[PDB]
Every structure is written in structure tokens, then in C-alpha cells.
Design an enzyme around this catalytic site. Structure first.
Site, PDB file in Angstrom:
ATOM      1  N   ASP A  16      91.966  50.590  -6.901  1.00  0.00           N
ATOM      2  CA  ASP A  16      91.815  52.032  -7.110  1.00  0.00           C
ATOM      3  C   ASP A  16      90.545  52.468  -7.861  1.00  0.00           C
ATOM      4  O   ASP A  16      90.379  53.652  -8.179  1.00  0.00           O
ATOM      5  CB  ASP A  16      93.060  52.596  -7.820  1.00  0.00           C
ATOM      6  CG  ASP A  16      93.294  51.994  -9.211  1.00  0.00           C
ATOM      7  OD1 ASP A  16      92.397  51.331  -9.769  1.00  0.00           O
ATOM      8  OD2 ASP A  16      94.400  52.197  -9.758  1.00  0.00           O
ATOM      9  N   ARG A  30      87.671  56.755  -9.944  1.00  0.00           N
ATOM     10  CA  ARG A  30      89.081  56.437  -9.880  1.00  0.00           C
ATOM     11  C   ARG A  30      89.569  57.232  -8.662  1.00  0.00           C
ATOM     12  O   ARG A  30      89.352  58.440  -8.568  1.00  0.00           O
ATOM     13  CB  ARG A  30      89.740  56.913 -11.180  1.00  0.00           C
ATOM     14  CG  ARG A  30      91.249  56.914 -11.234  1.00  0.00           C
ATOM     15  CD  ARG A  30      91.851  55.543 -11.055  1.00  0.00           C
ATOM     16  NE  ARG A  30      92.497  55.481  -9.753  1.00  0.00           N
ATOM     17  CZ  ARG A  30      93.810  55.486  -9.560  1.00  0.00           C
ATOM     18  NH1 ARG A  30      94.650  55.479 -10.586  1.00  0.00           N
ATOM     19  NH2 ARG A  30      94.275  55.445  -8.325  1.00  0.00           N
ATOM     20  N   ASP A  35      98.193  55.025  -6.519  1.00  0.00           N
ATOM     21  CA  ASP A  35      98.549  54.045  -7.543  1.00  0.00           C
ATOM     22  C   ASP A  35      98.661  52.679  -6.872  1.00  0.00           C
ATOM     23  O   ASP A  35      99.646  52.393  -6.189  1.00  0.00           O
ATOM     24  CB  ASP A  35      99.890  54.389  -8.203  1.00  0.00           C
ATOM     25  CG  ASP A  35      99.770  55.462  -9.278  1.00  0.00           C
ATOM     26  OD1 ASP A  35      98.651  55.692  -9.790  1.00  0.00           O
ATOM     27  OD2 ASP A  35     100.810  56.068  -9.623  1.00  0.00           O
ATOM     28  N   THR A  36      97.639  51.852  -7.037  1.00  0.00           N
ATOM     29  CA  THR A  36      97.626  50.521  -6.445  1.00  0.00           C
ATOM     30  C   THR A  36      98.063  49.447  -7.438  1.00  0.00           C
ATOM     31  O   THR A  36      97.894  49.611  -8.647  1.00  0.00           O
ATOM     32  CB  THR A  36      96.208  50.157  -5.965  1.00  0.00           C
ATOM     33  OG1 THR A  36      95.298  50.186  -7.072  1.00  0.00           O
ATOM     34  CG2 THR A  36      95.734  51.137  -4.929  1.00  0.00           C
ATOM     35  N   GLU A  38      97.808  46.563  -9.815  1.00  0.00           N
ATOM     36  CA  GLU A  38      96.592  46.133 -10.483  1.00  0.00           C
ATOM     37  C   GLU A  38      96.395  44.650 -10.670  1.00  0.00           C
ATOM     38  O   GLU A  38      97.343  43.869 -10.707  1.00  0.00           O
ATOM     39  CB  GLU A  38      96.437  46.829 -11.837  1.00  0.00           C
ATOM     40  CG  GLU A  38      96.150  48.320 -11.753  1.00  0.00           C
ATOM     41  CD  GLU A  38      95.777  48.917 -13.093  1.00  0.00           C
ATOM     42  OE1 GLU A  38      94.911  48.340 -13.781  1.00  0.00           O
ATOM     43  OE2 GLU A  38      96.347  49.963 -13.456  1.00  0.00           O
ATOM     44  N   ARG A  82      85.728  58.358 -15.875  1.00  0.00           N
ATOM     45  CA  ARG A  82      85.744  58.007 -14.461  1.00  0.00           C
ATOM     46  C   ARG A  82      85.873  59.260 -13.605  1.00  0.00           C
ATOM     47  O   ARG A  82      86.720  60.115 -13.882  1.00  0.00           O
ATOM     48  CB  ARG A  82      86.923  57.083 -14.175  1.00  0.00           C
ATOM     49  CG  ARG A  82      86.941  55.852 -15.047  1.00  0.00           C
ATOM     50  CD  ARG A  82      88.092  54.945 -14.673  1.00  0.00           C
ATOM     51  NE  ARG A  82      89.386  55.581 -14.870  1.00  0.00           N
ATOM     52  CZ  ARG A  82      90.550  54.974 -14.672  1.00  0.00           C
ATOM     53  NH1 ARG A  82      90.577  53.711 -14.262  1.00  0.00           N
ATOM     54  NH2 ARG A  82      91.683  55.630 -14.874  1.00  0.00           N
TER      55      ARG A  82
END
EC number: 3.1.31.1
Length: 136
Positions: A16, A30, A35-36, A38, A82
Site C-alpha cells: 500500500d 499511501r 488495507d493490504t 503488511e 505521505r
């Protein structure tokens, strides 16, 4: 309304997060509404499917001829500096591709940045019907 702007890939960081040269200056972006799993998670180690999501994003941006960023209507940077945007690799939104492939969940809206939430919601629904990756 929203508009795409050119950028240049510098380094793919996580599923992400990608570092890009935006307007002659390096920036960490970002990916919005996603929502990947991590690989670089503060608390909790390399989560399931983390490596896959990282490879997917990396592959997609590195093989692209044109990278474009699209800021939404809300805040354009988070508390870490970000940039918050929709990233496109040759016309394909990386945010949507991750969701459609079941390598990310659609996150909560962040301060009015929800223009593409509905679109992403539909792709996520399809990915779970297909029991893809995360939805196995």
C-alpha cells in the site's frame, strides 16, 4: 473534480506504499481506501498475503510506462507526510486492482477522501464471491 497528474516511480515500498517523484520532489504515497496485509508492520510480523500484495503492487508500477497520481477532495497528506492518492499504472488504478485480486480490503474513508469508495466496494464484493486470496 479530480484529475490525474504524472509522477515517476522511485521505489515500491509495500503493498500500500510507493515512493514517487511528484513535481520534481520525492514523496511517499499511501494508496487511498485500501488495507493490504503488511510486510513492514510496526506491531505484528509479516502478515499472511503480505509478500503477495507487495509483489503485486511492485510488479504493477515497475512495468508501467506511465504512472499517474490522483488526489481526492479531502486531506492530501496523512500525519506521517505521505500523500494520499489513487495511483494509476498505464490507466489502471493500482488501488482497485489490489482489491479486485483479493489482496486488500477497502478501508475506512479518511476525511472526505471517498470518491472511489463505491467502485472499490463492488470490486471487493466480487473478489470475496470468488474466494480470492484473502477471501479463501
Amino acid at each position: 473534480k479530480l484529475h490525474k497528474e504524472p509522477a515517476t516511480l522511485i521505489k515500491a515500498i509495500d503493498g500500500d506504499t510507493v515512493k514517487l517523484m511528484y513535481k520534481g520532489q520525492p514523496m511517499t504515497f499511501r494508496l487511498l481506501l485500501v488495507d493490504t496485509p503488511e510486510t513492514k508492520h510496526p506491531k505484528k510480523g509479516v502478515e499472511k498475503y503480505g509478500p503477495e500484495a507487495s509483489a503485486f503492487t511492485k510488479k504493477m508500477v515497475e512495468n508501467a510506462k506511465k504512472i499517474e497520481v490522483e488526489f481526492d477532495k479531502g486531506q492530501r497528506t496523512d500525519k506521517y507526510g505521505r500523500g494520499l492518492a489513487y495511483i494509476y499504472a498505464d490507466g489502471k488504478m493500482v488501488n482497485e486492482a489490489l482489491v479486485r485480486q483479493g489482496l486488500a480490503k477497502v478501508a475506512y474513508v479518511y476525511k472526505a477522501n471517498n470518491t472511489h469508495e463505491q467502485h472499490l466496494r463492488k470490486s471487493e464484493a466480487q473478489a470475496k464471491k470468488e474466494k480470492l486470496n484473502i477471501w479463501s
